[PDB]
Amino acid sequence: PILKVDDYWVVAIEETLHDQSVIQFKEELLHNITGVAGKGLVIDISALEVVDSFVTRVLIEISRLAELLGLPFVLTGIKPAVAITLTEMGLDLRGMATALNLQKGLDKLKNLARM
């Protein structure tokens, strides 16, 4: 489920039931964000109680693609615990845009485009 609000892409990742699902999502997302112009991307991982090695590298990839695309990208709903695994796993949470939740995510992206 990849929706669009005021030109921003919104994704919520839910607990999954296969790995092939995370690849389909990654492939569909990148297909969308390189297709028609968007102003930004928020992905919410608050549903994930633990972050698999699989989802980790996917976020690293999307984050890395969004930069190469010049697409604002904020990650939201990160608990203190899954935050430490992500950074160890190599996602630089400090140098990137994160927000408490989806509303704060949208706001943050909107705020930087008023600069």
Domain ranges of the chain: 1-114
Resolution, given in Å to one decimal, reads 2.3
Angle at which helices 53-68 and 80-88 pack, to 10 degrees? 70
Would you state the torsion angle of the CA atoms of residues 47, 53, 56, 61, taken in this order, to the nearest 10 degrees?
Answer: -140
Architecture of the structural domain at 1-114: 2-Layer Sandwich (3.30)
d(CA 42, CA 106): 7
d(CA 14, CA 9): 16
Tally of CA atoms within 13 A in the half-sphere of 11 that contains its CB? 21
Reading across the β-sheet that carries 8-12, which strands appear in turn? 3-5, 8-12, 40-44, 73-76, 97-99
d(CA 91, CA 33): 21
DSSP assignment string, 27-82: HHHHHHHTTS--SEEEEE-TT-SS--HHHHHHHHHHHHHHHHTT--EEEE---HHH
Expressed in angstroms, the distance from the first to the final Cα of the chain is: 30
Residue 99: closest CA among 83, 85, 81: 83
What are the tokens at 42?
A: 């928020």
Would you state the torsion angle of the CA atoms of residues 37, 48, 89, 98, taken in this order, to the nearest 10 degrees?
Answer: 50
Do the Cβ atoms of 76 and 46 come closer than 8 Å?
yes
Cα→Cα distances 82→5, 19, 20, 53, 107, Å: 27, 19, 22, 12, 23
Would you state the torsion angle of the CA atoms of residues 10, 35, 69, 78, taken in this order, to the nearest 10 degrees?
Answer: 20
Is the Cα torsion angle 11, 13, 23, 73 positive or negative in sign?
Answer: positive
In DSSP terms, 74 is beta-bridged to 42, 97
